[PDB]
Amino acid sequence: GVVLLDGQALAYSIEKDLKNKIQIITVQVHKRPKLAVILVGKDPASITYVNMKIKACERVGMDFDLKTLQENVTEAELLSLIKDYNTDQNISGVLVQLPLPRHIDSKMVLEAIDPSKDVDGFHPLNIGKLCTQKESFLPATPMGVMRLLKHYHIEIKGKDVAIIGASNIIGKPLSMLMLNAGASVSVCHILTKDISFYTQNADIVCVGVGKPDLIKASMLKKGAVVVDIGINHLNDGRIVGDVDFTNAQKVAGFITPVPKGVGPMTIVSLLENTLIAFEKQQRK
Ligand code: NA
Ligand code: NA
DSSP, rough: OOOOOOHHHHHHHHHHHHHHHHHHHHHHHHHOEEEEEESSSHHHHHHHHHHHHHHHHHHHOEEEEEEEOTTTTOHHHHHHHHHHHHTTTTTOOEEESSOOOSSSSSHHHHHHOGGGBBTTOOHHHHHHHHTTOOOOOOOHHHHHHHHHHHHTTOOOTEEEEEEEEEOOOTTTHHHHHHHHHTTTEEEEEEEEEHHHHHHOOOEEEEESSOOOTTTTGGSSSSSSSEEOOOEEEEESSEEEEOOHHHHHHTTTSSSSSSSSSHHHHHHHHHHHHHHHHHHHHHHO
């Protein structure tokens, strides 16, 4: 019997814990964790993502500051805003919604976030610490994937894991978390000659490239754990993953639905990182 990796249910359970911890903090020290969110421009999908993050903060009682900037904002203005958020002791985490406009150097803007407030885990200091087994902020999507697997008692150590997608924000950090946990890890992408070579061997397949039906049942090992990070908005309004869910469930042992699988876990991971940032700030 295949098991649904119910990321939505796990995220809601974690949110209940966050809400309770924040309630205690608010009464004990009369402060709350606070997330600063910067949105540049009016990209529809970016607006939706910002609203998802703000609504999540509201569900757990986390404070937030949403700063909306025009699409033609200068890099200097964005940097000056980030500097002020870095120095404001009442700001726990700082998040810049991506993508930024082409005239903005995204890597420079993200490196201006103080690493102690980098709740997205995108600062190279945090990425480098992850790669060298030093504790710091994990990117939210890989963090949520590992947390979901932990909840379902999926063993990582000694397992063969195939990661499809090699992005800086998902596939690469996820591969590092898997390796650090003792898996043998393959990272594939658009230039891979035969992804099925890697997926048919894998105990765990994680895919996040944005291509409907890329992962088919015939590409999987019987009993495999399948983590579908894709979120594809089809022309007709449907939202599907990168896995052929209907057929793959005939072979997989565990599988995330899309939507309501990895998505809610990414969001709750951002909330957890903001609380961690607050707690580390108070201890320092
Ligand atoms: Na300053
Ligand atoms: Na393990």
